[PDB]
Amino acid sequence: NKNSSYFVEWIPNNVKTAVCDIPPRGLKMSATFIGNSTAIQELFKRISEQFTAMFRRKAFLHWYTGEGMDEMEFTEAESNMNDLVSEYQQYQDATADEQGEFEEEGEEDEA
């Protein structure tokens, strides 16, 4: 309730609990956190901007192609990457509120 700005609005009741009888040695209680957030889009942006900085100029590539890769293999891994970082931004600022629908236009005559 405190973090309504940081929970996705079309996903109700976001948390999976579990409550084990046995805490770790020495701790009277503990908990493991696990979060899946749109925020991780900053790991993927960071990798892919740093990747493009080596890649677009072809830095160190002879070490990989010299083992037997090709540029294509890089291209298939980049195509996945640009899709996966887009699949984050697709859900960023996505809503529970409904979007409209449209007709076609293109016709005119003298009167």
Binding site: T52, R56, R57, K58, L61, E78, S79, M81, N82, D83, L84, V85, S86, E87, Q89, Q90, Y91, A94, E98
Partner: protein
């Protein structure tokens, strides 16, 4: 006789960097690739027909 030697030539030659040619991978580019698809295609408006 006329003494004082004949003539001797110097060893000196002009210099150039020969318009030399190498490889460059970086020179073959000026533009970046367009982005991936940021748009949902799975969503449905749940109308009871």
């Amino acid at each position: 006789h006329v003494p004082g030697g004949g003539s001797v030539q110097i060893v000196y030659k002009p210099v150039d960097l020969s318009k030399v040619t190498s490889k460059c991978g970086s020179l073959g580019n000026i533009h970046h690739k367009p982005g991936g698809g940021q748009v949902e295609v799975k969503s449905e408006k749940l109308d009871f027909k």
